[model samples]
Target chain A: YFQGVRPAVIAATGLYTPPDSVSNAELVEAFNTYVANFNAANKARIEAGEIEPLQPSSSEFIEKASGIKSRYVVAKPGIVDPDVMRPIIPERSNDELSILAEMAVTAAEQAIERWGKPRERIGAVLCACSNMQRAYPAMAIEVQNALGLGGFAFDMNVACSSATFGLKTAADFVGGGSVDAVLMVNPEICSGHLNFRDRDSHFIFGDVATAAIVERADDAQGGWSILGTKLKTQFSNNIRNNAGFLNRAWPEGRDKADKLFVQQGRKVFKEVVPLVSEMIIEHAREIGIDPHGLKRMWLHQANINMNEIIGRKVLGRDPTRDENVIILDDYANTSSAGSIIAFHKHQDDMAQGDLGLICSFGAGYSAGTVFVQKR
Target chain B: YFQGVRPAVIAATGLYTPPDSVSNAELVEAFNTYVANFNAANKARIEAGEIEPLQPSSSEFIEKASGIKSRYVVAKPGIVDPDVMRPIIPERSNDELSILAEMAVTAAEQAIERWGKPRERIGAVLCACSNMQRAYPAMAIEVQNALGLGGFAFDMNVACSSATFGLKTAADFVGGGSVDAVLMVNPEICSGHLNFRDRDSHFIFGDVATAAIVERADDAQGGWSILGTKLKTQFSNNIRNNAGFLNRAWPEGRDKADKLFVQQGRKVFKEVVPLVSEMIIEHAREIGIDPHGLKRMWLHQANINMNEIIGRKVLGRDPTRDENVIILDDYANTSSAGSIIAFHKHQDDMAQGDLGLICSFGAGYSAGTVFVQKR
Candidate 1:
């Protein structure tokens, strides 16, 4: 009685927002302002091309670049005071983590309530990349506490790839019969940690949260079956020990200490493009399926350039061919929440027997791919 | 093959510090010193009967009063200076998380390597209360990165009760054919957040990590089976946040303020004892097993009083009987690593046909019990 398996997906739910949205143009302007104010001393560096452009182009440029028509961001004007010229938002209580946790709980409850699953049978799996701002006990506990979900619950982190990883893990748990249903929530609060002084990274982050439900199938219509997954890691050659790396540290022996978020965009692109390409092939083969069979591919929305590189290299198809969707442009990088958001955005095209391949990559120099087929 | 089946605990291995031991007298001395130094102002309150005595004499006093006995503290004088009059340790860097991850990896590798299971057929489940102080990306990622064991890897948190949850989760994964073997690890660096100023909780915590491997039984000799698990929750109360709450908080609301920790003792004992007792009873009845039939009841070893209450209320056993072994006096409170450490300590006495009831209660006000029968 504890061994049979099936496949499922989020049945129905509501996505709650805090009555605020930061459009691409506004986001770019914010980034530009922060960059100009913080790096005023480096005006020559900016003109000399030593510092990258905060808003490389207009909002229209980002739309074409990220392929995302629009995205949501949570911001408070005076709360963060971007003009302060500090890399980090000044000390605040755990209100932000608590807020994100509430959003996750509300979304999960909406999904579970719509599906009408017994509360006792429902479990939750949270995917996060660090806490909202590096708090302890993790944001998952707060979500679990908020939901009053006493069933199987825990948090998982694999950098930006964790959302899909969380989904796969929840699927395994449900398939294993530990629980009859599972909720996967990913809340990426990376905007608060972005180094506004670093134009490239500042322009590439937006806060977001996504929740999905995976359940056991008895007589339901088609849902995605997690067929298999593949994970790979490259040697630790991309380790950046300085302040310019994606994860920057203060200069050694510096008295005024502040850790900045920096990304070696070029280096990350070079390493991830080929590795993601290889992973796509490996996962397709391992699952005894072909990438060409997949009706849709939800790649982690890193950037416009990366989306194109991976689409071309891995799927061997142009992303503009009506089968691909990139949500990063307007959303920036939502970290782990990007994959699920893309899946939700593309759920309409899914059909029985159609396949979907989800690939997510980020820090840890790691990548994960899941081969899912409509049940 | 995917239908009804039985999942067995194919193999189990655990490790504990055998050399480090603390006695009740030693604990009393430590408590007295802490009270004199940090709680000096509160001494008048206790003398005037405003606050209850931190230490009470009764076998039950061990878990409830002092809470832990022989916890493995990683303090070396100034290396892990006392914070807030609590025994605070140095913050662990990514390397320390990596080191702890490797220790768990070594144990898991030993079990899997000896069994010679295919890497593709193995999966991993890790449970941790907190990452090593200050480490980013979490300890689970480090383990997954270091092992490079290519099955499916995930991490979970449920405060101190996490390993028990992982065990049940692992069983579901193995039984469901997601993998043939599951390796679970629980590592806690609790000393990093220990609040010394709170005399009631200061002497009770130990830092340690534990790992176990569960597989599908190939032959009859691997007779132990995961009988069943029962999860229970009380909606209104949470002990981790209420009393003896040890967490780092910034003073004066400044960004660079030194972190301070706090805990309340009286409320903690009042809440934990009755809740855990109810959970144990509910689990026993749900499994349709007599509490008296349990050869040993392994409750979360937070304190002496709590353990005795669990024994009497759940197991219907007397503390005078050697059936309940109180190891907390020597090991202190190992957080999520406690239950397994207790299992390893009492392994010799665990006999074939004997039943073991394992229960853990944590921050979410969540409690769970799992039934295990010795092979």
Candidate 2:
């Protein structure tokens, strides 16, 4: 029988970056202008002690706070325009391909091209992401049709840890003989939900999509062997989004202002750093890998400070840039696509037999640790 | 390594139906009143042919078209009132439990109670449904926290087929030794997205939640043995929902009218009947079972006509009432929870060794067939 457990490999990876880019300096200038208008308009209220005046933000504060120098976006003009602090994405008709699925298909095409495998060998497609464009006709099925693949498809959400969660699910399906290969894509359009008017977290996100092909080792030519995968979730309300089907339930009582992304940044940093570090070390031990001897680490690119603390804790010393890869400076926090982007961009130089780790932690208070070895 | 494929079983099932129920007569009266008001207000437009006159619906017509007699809803006052053609769900604070997650935990609690095992044996949670309440802080994790269960959790969507997809995924995790048991819940608030003003489909959905526990056979006491599970998807735009994060991107040009559930029912009925029938028989043969010999079938409850046709084709004859259990008369279409509700409420009478099947099919043009034998 072909139903026995099978080893899975990460055969190839791909990425899709939007053409338009927004720098922190431009973002700060726009935010400052918005703040100026808000403060001027609310001057009377501030004087009456009924409201607080808005504060201006600077590029230096943004860089030091989040390590985000610039970010790519699907659309640029609307965001940079002081009058409108959001992207100008045109709503397409139902017959046309949805934007998220299009981005996923683009990245999947790149991964398929790099894998150099027959399209028929791909047995499933999973669209794992932080947020989706629609509630039905799952984005994964749309991507499958766009790529002309067969088998089955679905969508999954685990907040920022979706990429690693997808990897683990893909490997499990392969190990159980449900499929020979699974094409997992994380298409995070973070800018769509970012509250640009919020001064504390306005510059914390970017837009990107990443794809990875997980296949049975028997069919793989050469790739990284998955040693172990561990997932953990302890509920917390630190980060959340209330935009969903239920928003349409109460028309008169809807809170329009609270429907976007909101988070307690300090609370998340204090909580997630320790949880992720302990998870990584415990997973490394369970998989018989040394935490200190890891060649590289691709951590979720939420904040530079969180990554640094986690890297130091796991490696038992301050990590060099080569040992701990960080992509937040360029791409910012692309939600579920962050760790995948870091892994995809920085894994080419590792030597054979070297060990490495991939970890993601965020909303759901969820974390995923994946230990791998170069073949 | 404990990594080989292992047999899994459906250890228990649970259900939670809302307290408020609306009969077809009540729904038809409400819809007809709305149509009367619309036609009167737009008299000039209708006479000038600027828009077609709205048509009134009847209880007889609804029953003949969909075989739904009554449906339970989370709330009834807002829907039955002609002035407001929607539900009245109160929006809770971020710190409070979300309505969807609450329904899931209520149902999962029943399943966990019936399983008669220590809580620690349940290793993961999957909240699979048609529409989720938010884009982050996955409902599964919330349910896990609410129920005091440990392990990982996430959310998945495949429209109405989500329950079976969840079952297959749960089985894969067990087979791969990632977990001993997985709790899967389908908390579908289908009424949230149903366009109540649309006469043709106002009676097509209801609100309810269903849960199932899939566990390794070694751990299960007495339950249904999962002989085989197969899933297939062929993308079609016959059904869709356009409500998601992208809707907030363009405020000035946002489409206010097309943001809810929609489907070309005739097209879906014609295409999906053959697709699901053939899939069931093919999967039966693969698992060395005879489709004609199945003792019963719990099929997706979108429409009575589709199920009758699929049942007849798979069995090569008309299926008796007991042989094909239909839950639509009382529950309408609960989306992902329909088939599970049928299986959960109707299987107690079956004797050991009797074979049956569980199937779900809907948007994504997706279908899942799971063959099982009573223990």
Best by lDDT: 2
Encode model 1's per-residue lDDT on B211-263: one tens digit a residue. 77777665224435667876544332233331110111111232121232233
lDDT of each: 0.58, 0.90
lDDT by residue (A305-365, candidate 2, tens digit) is 8999999999999999989999999999998899999999999778889888889999998
For residues A29-141, what per-residue lDDT tens digits would candidate 1 score against the true structure? Answer: 66556655756767788889887644333566555544544445455452134564222323335334355566677666766666675666666545444333222334565
Fnat per model, in the order shown: 0.18, 0.92
- Going through the candidates in order, their DockQ values are 0.20, 0.80
Error of 2 at B101 (Å): 1.2
How far does residue B142 in candidate 2 sit from its true spot (Å)? 0.8
Worst 10 residues of 1 chain A by lDDT: A242-251
Model 2 Cα lDDT, one tens digit per residue, B1-375: 344588899999999999999999999889889899989999999999998998888888888888999999988998899988888888998778889999998898899899989979889999999988998899999999989999999999999999999999999999888899999999989988998988778899999999999999987889999988999989988888888887778654333656778888989988999999999999998889989999999999879989999999988899998999989999999999999999999998999999999999999989999899998
Error of 1 at B190 (Å): 0.4
- In model 2, which regions exceed 4 Å deviation? A1-3, A252-255, B252-255
- Candidate 2 residue A160 Cα shift, in angstroms, is 0.2
Q: DockQ of candidate 1?
A: 0.20
Docking class of 2: medium
